[PDB]
Write a protein that binds this ligand. Structure first.
Ligand SMILES: [Mg+2]
Lengths: 51, 123, 237, 49, 49, 104, 53, 230, 171
RNA sequence: UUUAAAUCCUUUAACGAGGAUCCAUUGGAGGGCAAGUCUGGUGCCAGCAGCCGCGGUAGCUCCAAUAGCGUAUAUU
């Protein structure tokens, strides 16, 4: 009954929420997370490989 | 008898027909009148046509056979419009009736037999 | 809605020869009118700029239902002789007459005297239709009127369809000719299943030295119907 | 393939694996000293195992 | 797609069953001394041709 | 439109060995509940021109559906014969007889 | 809430089963109005007949 | 309480108990003295045409197109079905406690005993035939009547004559006595208590519909006297 | 018992058959199909066993006559089809049309199959004098003309229901 | 009403539904996540997993059976 144990645990579907930029640094821009930096990181790697 | 009323039913087959008409009216599967019989032929929703040969001008119903031969629809005549009047549950003489297609109707077995009997009249 | 009268519309040829497509907001199947300005059963016709086309109704016709269903071959082409069994009033016959054109001929067979009077009125206006008011079960009775033909179209709707076609095919159909037969499952055998009926009729056809080639159903327009296309006495390849 | 109205009766293994790829066709085969049907809903009096 | 099939269910297969017999099915039927028509009727409780 | 409770008599016979008349009673009451035995006694007494004290009825069973009820009834010649022949519990149902506890 | 009653669960499964069938095969309809066109295109390139051999 | 047209009414003779039937295939019992409803009876398969009663706690019904005539033993809770002549049964009347007469739209007249499932006597084409050559059909019988405790039976149709009948020994035969000339649809026939005269209801149309309209007829009630010498 | 679980628990064809049946006749679960299939299997096995006997055997004559009378009176067969072959021809849809639910749907007293089941389960349908609330009731041939609304029902001219009375008291 | 008395069965008056929350289960297979923890590498990766995070404490989807549904041992 391994799946039965899994179904009970996943009864609650509230997922962890994201934190925002602090107010006193609002004019700088959005606080980047791993999902955002990965877009900027893969962009650099493609150009350097091409050169 | 006027020869234009060729499919004329006998005594025994008339009893089966008028019983089936009375059954069909209860199941809301019957269209009464010359004009209403014509409309079902256009829509292709008729099993057969029952007409009254005792109309004083026989010509007013002779347009129905022409439509039947194109749709391959059997048709018969009966000797009385007044006998046709009661079986349809109407208080007036009726010269033409049409029984409608109904999906899943329990009258299919009885209708299937009566169509075969009509075709036997044409030999 | 539909194709209202007074709408701009395009006519382009179909894959089959002699058949046309009426391209517009909705598409209809049309054939070129042999006698301009006349409607035989009230269909909607289109004027093209001296030239006119007539719409083909697939609910009232068994050949048009097959064409819309995607049949591979119909073998009715301009300049061909076509023998039609079971002409009835002439709704389908008129469209067949349009395809064959002035050169081809249509032999219309209809036993009933009531519907026979409509063919003669229709044959008056169309010079390439030969009315034959005779029983199709006895081809020897009208062997005077009919020469060799190329295509036999059968819509007789009888329990003995195969035998009727077999007699006429031997007497009149030329070698290498083709045949189109419409099968109504409820007519041959109501007791047996519709699918087993289609297998039995094909079996009888092969016993009559006829080679069936294709079949398809006409489901969106008709229930328990099939159309079988084949060749008679094929030439060696 | 053409007609879809037949029931195939055979005992060869190789033919049976081809017919299983065609949808909607039963297969009849001999099991023990009795006849058996494979892909038919209305089997009724079939060997129960 | 044929109209007889409702997904994988064959509707037009009917109580008169048409059965195509393979050449090997005949031989094993005699070896087990099973009557060809009679055993099919016992399996399906219906007319078989 | 008013609904009424109707009484019908069947298998009526006169038993002279016990001085009574016995019958089967059919009660028709289409809409109401089962009629109490006292009202049946009053109606039957009016029907047979006797006082209610000599009518004893029992065994009323209502058919499924609520239409009709079937029971049994007996009418005696006089009150003394009724007290003399009836079983004790039916008399106690009318209050004529009282059961007495016995010490063991 | 659908899983609470098995009968209405089977009712809903049939309604989908008819919809999913509509892709494979065409449903029969009568000529309830005068024929006014196909309401879609007419494709002349598809050959959907079954070859017999 | 009835759900369709009421086509039958008859009192129990000597009482105030009223029996009614309707096109809704049900038979109901009422107490006119107590203005109360008693019970409902079932078993018919089509609209009922007429209902007749007598001294006994029983009633008889005409089944119309159902083709049956039924005897209702109410207190015994028993039902009898009689299959007789072909066609719809449109009228019924009792002769005595053990005999009745019924009429049909096929022209037949049937004599029934309440103890036998088939008619004792059956007279076909009681009012003759009509129609064009090749389309001849019997006259429709509209009403029948009988004088209590005798063999006298009267039938009426649109054959322009009212026919008097006598029942044979054992009610095994019906013989025509005389024809009373009267033009129109004889919708109702009622004998007198003394039996000295007959009252007939004549109308231009049949009582149920407008299938025919007779112009020469008059909408009137006719008293036909019966005069006897031995 | 009255049913047997299927020999093969995983067949696409069998699942599609059961799905089509339940969808068309508004059944509750698979048991309502399997019971009918069990009864039909019993009847057809009996018919085949009688069919294996000689024609002139008295036992075959008696048992076949009894079986044919029963099948005709329950309405599955036809009066002119009194042969064993037509017994072998029977399907399960023939038995499914004879339920009270399907009949009360077909005579128009209800306007849907699930509406028919709801009407039956709430004591709205009568057969002759008796009130029947069992959806799987098999209607005999004679009783088919005696299905109607019950006299005490709101639809049969009886007293109006709870909601009507409460709204009338409201206004 | 029933019965020695009473219960039960059958009649029957009055209340009793919008998220109709007056809330069906058991087994199988998937998706979704942080300034969170651990382990190993091939910079930004992968596995395992995740009600635990900086501060704060006032009810996702699909499949099979359905008032029923699994697991373990032996076995045919
Ligand atoms: Mg609401």
């Amino acid at each position: 009954m391994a799946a039965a144990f899994r179904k009970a645990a996943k009864s609650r579907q509230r997922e962890h929420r994201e934190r925002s930029q602090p107010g006193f640094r609002k004019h700088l821009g959005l606080l980047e997370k791993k999902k955002d930096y990965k877009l900027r990181a893969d962009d650099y790697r493609k150009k350097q490989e091409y050169l | 008898v006027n020869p234009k009323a060729y499919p004329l039913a006998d005594a025994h087959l008339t009893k089966k027909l008028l019983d089936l008409v009375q059954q069909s009216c209860n199941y809301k599967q019957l269209r009464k009148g010359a004009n209403e019989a014509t409309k079902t032929l256009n829509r292709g929703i008729s099993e057969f046509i029952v007409m009254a040969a005792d109309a004083e001008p026989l010509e007013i119903i002779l347009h129905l056979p022409l439509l039947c031969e194109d749709k391959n629809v059997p048709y018969v005549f009966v000797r009385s419009k007044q006998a046709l009047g009661r079986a349809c549950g109407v208080s007036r003489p009726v010269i033409a009736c049409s029984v409608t297609i109904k999906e899943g109707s329990q009258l299919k077995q009885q209708i299937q037999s009566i169509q075969q009997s009509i075709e036997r009249l044409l030999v | 809605r539909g194709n209202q009268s007074g709408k701009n519309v395009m006519v382009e040829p179909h894959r089959h020869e002699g058949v046309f497509i009426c391209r517009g907001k909705e598409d209809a199947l049309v054939t070129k009118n042999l006698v301009p300005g006349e409607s035989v059963y009230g269909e909607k016709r289109v004027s093209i700029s001296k030239i006119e086309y007539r719409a083909w109704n697939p609910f009232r016709s068994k050949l048009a239902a097959a064409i819309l269903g995607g049949v591979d071959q119909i073998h009715i082409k301009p300049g061909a002789k076509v023998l039609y069994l079971g002409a009835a009033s002439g709704t389908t016959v008129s469209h067949v007459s349009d395809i064959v054109g002035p050169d081809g001929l249509v032999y219309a067979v209809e036993f009933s005297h009531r519907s026979g009077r409509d063919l003669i009125n229709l044959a008056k206006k169309r010079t390439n239709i030969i009315p034959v008011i005779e029983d199709a079960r006895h081809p020897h009775k009208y062997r005077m009127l009919i020469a060799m033909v190329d295509v036999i179209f059968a819509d007789v709707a009888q329990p003995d369809q195969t035998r009727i076609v077999a007699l006429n095919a031997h007497t009149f159909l030329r070698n290498g000719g083709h045949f189109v037969i419409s099968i109504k499952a409820n007519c041959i055998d109501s007791t047996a299943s519709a699918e087993a009926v289609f297998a039995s009729e094909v079996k009888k056809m092969q016993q009559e030295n006829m080679k069936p080639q294709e079949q398809l159903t006409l489901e969106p327009y008709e229930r328990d119907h099939a159309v079988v296309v084949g060749v008679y006495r094929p030439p060696p390849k | 393939t053409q007609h879809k109205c037949y029931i195939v009766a055979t005992v060869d293994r190789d033919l049976k694996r081809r017919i299983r790829k065609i949808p909607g066709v039963p297969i009849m085969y001999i099991s023990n000293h009795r006849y058996n049907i494979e892909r038919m809903p209305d089997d009724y009096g079939a060997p129960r195992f | 797609h044929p109209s007889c099939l409702f997904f994988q269910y064959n509707t037009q297969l009917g109580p008169p069953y048409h059965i195509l017999v393979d050449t090997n099915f005949i031989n094993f039927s005699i070896k087990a001394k099973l009557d060809l028509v009679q055993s099919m009727m016992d399996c399906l409780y219906a007319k078989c041709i | 439109m008013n609904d009424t409770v109707t009484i019908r008599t069947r298998k009526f016979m006169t038993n002279r060995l016990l001085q009574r008349k016995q019958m089967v009673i059919d009660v028709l009451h289409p809409g109401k509940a089962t009629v109490p035995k006292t009202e049946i006694r009053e109606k039957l007494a009016k029907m047979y021109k006797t006082t209610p004290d000599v009518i004893f009825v029992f065994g009323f069973r209502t058919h499924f559906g609520g239409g009709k009820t079937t029971g049994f009834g007996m009418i005696y010649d006089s009150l003394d014969y009724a007290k003399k022949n009836e079983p004790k519990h039916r008399l106690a149902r009318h209050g004529l007889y009282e059961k007495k506890k016995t010490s063991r | 809430k659908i899983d609470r009653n098995p009968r209405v669960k089977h009712r809903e499964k049939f309604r989908r089963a008819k919809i999913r069938r509509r892709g494979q095969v065409r449903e029969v309809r009568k000529e309830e109005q005068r024929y006014s066109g196909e309401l879609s295109g007419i494709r002349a390139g598809v050959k959907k007949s079954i070859k017999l051999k | 309480g009835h759900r369709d047209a009421v086509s039958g009414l008859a009192f129990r003779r000597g009482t105030h108990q009223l029996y009614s039937t309707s096109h809704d295939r049900s038979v109901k019992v009422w107490n006119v003295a107590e203005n109360s409803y008693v019970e409902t009876l079932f078993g018919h398969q089509d609209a009922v045409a007429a209902l007749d009663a007598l001294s006994r706690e029983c009633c008889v019904t005409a089944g119309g197109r159902d083709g049956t005539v039924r005897v209702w033993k109410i207190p015994e809770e028993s039902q009898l079905v009689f299959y007789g002549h072909q066609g719809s049964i449109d009228c019924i009347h009792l002769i005595n406690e053990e005999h009745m007469v019924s009429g049909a739209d096929d022209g037949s007249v049937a004599l029934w005993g309440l103890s036998k499932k088939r008619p004792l006597a059956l007279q076909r084409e009681a009012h003759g035939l009509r129609g064009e050559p090749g389309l001849e059909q019997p006259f429709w019988i509209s009403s029948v009547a009988a004088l209590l405790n005798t063999d006298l039976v009267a039938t009426g149709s649109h054959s322009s004559c009212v026919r008097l009948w006598q029942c044979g020994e054992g009610f095994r035969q019906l013989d025509l006595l005389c024809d009373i000339p009267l033009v129109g649809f004889i919708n109702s026939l009622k004998f007198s208590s003394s039996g000295d005269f007959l009252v007939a209801g004549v109308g231009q149309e049949h009582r149920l519909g407008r299938w025919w309209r007779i112009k020469e007829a008059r909408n009137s009630v006719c008293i036909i006297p019966l005069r006897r010498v031995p | 018992k009255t049913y047997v679980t299927p020999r093969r628990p995983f067949e696409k064809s069998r699942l599609d058959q059961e799905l089509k049946l339940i969808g068309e006749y508004g059944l509750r679960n698979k048991r309502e199909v399997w019971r009918v299939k069990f009864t039909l299997a019993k009847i057809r096995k009996a018919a085949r066993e009688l069919l294996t006997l000689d024609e002139k055997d008295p036992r075959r004559l008696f048992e076949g006559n009894a079986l044919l009378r029963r099948l005709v009176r329950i309405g599955v067969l036809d009066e002119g089809k009194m042969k064993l072959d037509y017994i072998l021809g029977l399907k399960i849809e023939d038995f499914l049309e004879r339920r009270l639910q399907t009949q009360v749907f077909k005579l128009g007293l209800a306007k849907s199959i699930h509406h028919a089941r709801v009407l039956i389960r709430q004591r709205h349908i009568r057969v002759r004098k008796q009130v029947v609330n069992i959806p799987s009731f098999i209607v005999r041939l004679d009783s088919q003309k005696h299905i109607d609304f019950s006299l005490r029902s709101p639809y049969g001219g009886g007293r109006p229901g709870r909601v009507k009375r409460k709204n009338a008291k409201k206004g």
